[PDB]
Amino acid sequence: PYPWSNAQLSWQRTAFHFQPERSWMSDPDGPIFYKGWYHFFYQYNPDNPVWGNNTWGHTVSRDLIHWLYLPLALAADQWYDMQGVFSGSATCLPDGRIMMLYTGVTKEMVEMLSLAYPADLSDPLLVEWVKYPGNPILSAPPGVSPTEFRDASTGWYVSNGTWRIAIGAKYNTTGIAMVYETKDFKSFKLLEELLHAVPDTGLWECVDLYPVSTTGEKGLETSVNGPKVKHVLKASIDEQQRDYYAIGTYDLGTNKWTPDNPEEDVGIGLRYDWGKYYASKTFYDPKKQRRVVWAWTKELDSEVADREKGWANVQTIPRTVLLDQKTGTNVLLWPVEEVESLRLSSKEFSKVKAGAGSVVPLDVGTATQLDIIAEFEIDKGYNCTTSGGAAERGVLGPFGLLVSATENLSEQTPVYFYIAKNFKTFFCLDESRSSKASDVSKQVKGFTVPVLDGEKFTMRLLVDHSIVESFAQGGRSCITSRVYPTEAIYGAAKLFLFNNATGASITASLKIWEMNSAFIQPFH
Numbered sequence: 001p002y003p004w005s006n007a008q009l010s011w012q013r014t015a016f017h018f019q020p021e022r023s024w025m026s027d028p029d030g031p032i033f034y035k036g037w038y039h040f041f042y043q044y045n046p047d048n049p050v051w052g053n054n055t056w057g058h059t060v061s062r063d064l065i066h067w068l069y070l071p072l073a074l075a076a077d078q079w080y081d082m083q084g085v086f087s088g089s090a091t092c093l094p095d096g097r098i099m100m101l102y103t104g105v106t107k108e109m110v111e112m113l114s115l116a117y118p119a120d121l122s123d124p125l126l127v128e129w130v131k132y133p134g135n136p137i138l139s140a141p142p143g144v145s146p147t148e149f150r151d152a153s154t155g156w157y158v159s160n161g162t163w164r165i166a167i168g169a170k171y172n173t174t175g176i177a178m179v180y181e182t183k184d185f186k187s188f189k190l191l192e193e194l195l196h197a198v199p200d201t202g203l204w205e206c207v208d209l210y211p212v213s214t215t216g217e218k219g220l221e222t223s224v225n226g227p228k229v230k231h232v233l234k235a236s237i238d239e240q241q242r243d244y245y246a247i248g249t250y251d252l253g254t255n256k257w258t259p260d261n262p263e264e265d266v267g268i269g270l271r272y273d274w275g276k277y278y279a280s281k282t283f284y285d286p287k288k289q290r291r292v293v294w295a296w297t298k299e300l301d302s303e304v305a306d307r308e309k310g311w312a313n314v315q316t317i318p319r320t321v322l323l324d325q326k327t328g329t330n331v332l333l334w335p336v337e338e339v340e341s342l343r344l345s346s347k348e349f350s351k352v353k354a355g356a357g358s359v360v361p362l363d364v365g366t367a368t369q370l371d372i373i374a375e376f377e378i379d380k381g382y383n384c385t386t387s388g389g390a391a392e393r394g395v396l397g398p399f400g401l402l403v404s405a406t407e408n409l410s411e412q413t414p415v416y417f418y419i420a421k422n423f424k425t426f427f428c429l430d431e432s433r434s435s436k437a438s439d440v441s442k443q444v445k446g447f448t449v450p451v452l453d454g455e456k457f458t459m460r461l462l463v464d465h466s467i468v469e470s471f472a473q474g475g476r477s478c479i480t481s482r483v484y485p486t487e488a489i490y491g492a493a494k495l496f497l498f499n500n501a502t503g504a505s506i507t508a509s510l511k512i513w514e515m516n517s518a519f520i521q522p523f524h
């Protein structure tokens with residue numbers, strides 16, 4: 001139990017990621033774009049920096065970045081949601097109406113579906129929310145447990161005024177996704193056929209079904225379907241606290257989603273992010289024609305420090321979701337372009353040489369608020385999780401960057417590539433020496449990343465105090481993590497380029513931006 005100072009704890013607050021003024025925040029809830037405003041709702045405990053006397057926090061921004069706090073959107077104030085207003089999604093109807101589906105928990109721990117909608121659709125800010133007088137509207141079916149019946153998705157249109165929503169659950173140890181049909185979002189009929197099911201995954205939380213284009217570079221509206229449209233099916237795997245997705249096709253007639261690769265099905269294949277990243281929700285952004293993904297990153301320190309500091313958990317910068325059209329077998333995740341508006345000044349390091357077993361210092365000034373773009377070339381079974389991280393020297397790795405580092409490397413957070421003997425490229429983040437405090441996460445996170453012919457090794461790092469976001473090969477693989485240095489804070493936080501391979505020297509080019517605050521504040 002490390003004795004944290006006031007200065008160490010205050011440093012942990014992020015400059016440009018979304019978080020409330022104080023207390024606990026988790027799952028993203030019904031994000032929409034409405035009348036010039038980006039709306040974001042979130043799980044919020046008003047009382048303490050722990051999960052959770054669940055209510056829905058509400059915030060708005062013009063550009064998915066400069067957020068403004070609003071009054072609380074939904075409270076635990078009715079018998080059917082007294083134990084919490086759990087997660088949920090918004091469906092926009094063609095007549096301008098917004099239907100917000102959320103899970104309500106009774107004091108008996110029973111979870112039921114309920115409807116909320118704007119009190120006043122003429123208000124762009126959508127401050128006041130009303131609960132549908134006929135709540136609750138849906139309880140668990142026979143197969144599914146009534147204490148584990150949660151997380152309705154955004155609806156997609158079928159015909160004759162019929163919409164479908166997806167609710168994930170389980171049969172025994174089989175993760176499943178049920179589909180309900182509705183015409184008014186007040187009554188639901190359970191379909192006989194499941195959307196999909198995968199053995200040995202456990203409970204599926206926050207399921208998400210959405211179209212991706214196979215030719216365009218735009219996002220698609222959720223109801224879009226056709227011959228050149230693929231569907232991503234995504235579930236949060238509760239037993240793991242990790243998000244998984246797969247690429248396949250969805251048929252409106254059969255109501256079936258089928259994976260393009262069954263060995264990489266939902267829960268047993270790819271992740272959006274290989275670090276701390278959970279309960280991700282997407283929405284369609286009609287202004288820039290994008291699909292944007294939201295997700296929260298839990299604290300990786302002790303609960304004692306959370307209580308001492310007064311708050312817990314951040315949202316990652318929202319990312320775009322596109323199909324990787326170069327591989328055809330993964331998605332590209334990339335921070336929204338508006339994050340670039342935070343860039344202040346840049347410093348370039350052109351063709352820097354790093355020999356085997358070397359550490360090259362990168363003078364950038366302050367290194368706690370950064371956007372780093374780096375390309376790497378090599379001149380002239382492994383597994384990140386079970387590896388020794390940056391200390392495990394191989395012939396062609398590890399090499400890359402050290403962020404959140406002290407002058408003498410007493411604390412360090414490597415983000416690195418490791419090439420292993422066919423050639424597998426690994427992209428990992430090493431938490432093992434991030435902090436001198438023993439009561440934090442000391443894990444090595446990561447996975448393989450595809451590198452195609454001609455491509456350099458590229459990583460983008462978003463550094464923002466106690467959160468690091470990393471992106472390999474344009475976002476084919478991402479790693480989000482939390483760091484809690486005891487010494488590498490304020491002026492003492494430094495940045496290095498390293499190469500710990502035994503038989504390879506690397507050459508790198510970096511552009512490093514200093515990042516401004518997002519100035520997150522209460523709405524005027």
Ligand SMILES: *[C@@H]1O[C@H](CO)[C@@H](O[C@@H]2O[C@H](CO)[C@@H](O[C@@H]3O[C@H](CO[C@H]4O[C@H](CO)[C@@H](O)[C@H](O)[C@@H]4O)[C@@H](O)[C@H](O[C@H]4O[C@H](CO)[C@@H](O)[C@H](O)[C@@H]4O)[C@@H]3O[C@H]3OC[C@@H](O)[C@H](O)[C@H]3O)[C@H](O)[C@H]2NC(C)=O)[C@H](O[C@@H]2O[C@@H](C)[C@@H](O)[C@@H](O)[C@@H]2O)[C@H]1NC(C)=O
Pocket residue numbers: 173200201267268383384385386
């Ligand atoms: C690279 O190495 C890492 C580490 O070795 C691999 O990840 C590990 O993968 C194993 C399974 O291969 C996971 O084991 C499972 O552990 C669960 C409990 O986990 C708890 O304890 C952890 C401590 O180790 C802790 O970190 C967690 O927070 C958690 O509290 C078990 O419940 C689970 O059993 C149940 O599920 C299985 C099948 O899903 C089923 O049989 C039953 O329903 C069980 O109830 C499972 O236990 C297994 O391991 C022990 C064996 O004796 C059993 O037979 C197995 O069932 C492990 O959690 C995981 N560790 C991580 C991610 O840190 C990694 O594998 C890949 O990633 C994981 C997530 C998985 O998706 C694999 O399919 C991937 O291959 C390695 N990468 C590779 C091989 O590419």
Ligand SMILES: *[C@@H]1O[C@H](CO)[C@@H](O[C@@H]2O[C@H](CO)[C@@H](O[C@@H]3O[C@H](CO)[C@@H](O)[C@H](O)[C@@H]3O)[C@H](O)[C@H]2NC(C)=O)[C@H](O)[C@H]1NC(C)=O
Pocket residue numbers: 359390391392393433498500
């Ligand atoms: C490049 O790889 C080398 C070789 O592994 C790294 O040096 C090694 O660093 C590790 C971890 O710091 C040292 O291991 C020991 O870990 C325990 C923790 O349980 C610690 O208490 C011990 O004091 C010890 O540090 C190891 O001594 C050290 N080995 C050598 C030969 O120097 C090096 O740090 C890597 N470069 C990086 C990460 O930039």
Ligand SMILES: *[C@@H]1O[C@H](CO)[C@@H](O[C@@H]2O[C@H](CO)[C@@H](O)[C@H](O)[C@H]2NC(C)=O)[C@H](O[C@@H]2O[C@@H](C)[C@@H](O)[C@@H](O)[C@@H]2O)[C@H]1NC(C)=O
Pocket residue numbers: 143171172
């Ligand atoms: C989860 O596993 C259960 C236990 O293995 C399944 O029930 C078993 O089903 C067998 C063959 O269908 C049957 O001979 C066993 O008697 C029965 N065992 C028990 C303890 O009930 C169960 O399958 C469901 O329930 C049974 C009773 C049938 O109605 C099946 O058609 C059901 O699929 C599995 N549960 C689920 C929700 O799939």
Ligand SMILES: *[C@@H]1O[C@H](CO)[C@@H](O)[C@H](O)[C@H]1NC(C)=O
Pocket residue numbers: 045047048050051052053
């Ligand atoms: C919920 O609220 C009560 C009273 O407002 C509080 O005492 C309790 O500990 C809270 N639960 C939390 C913070 O998890």
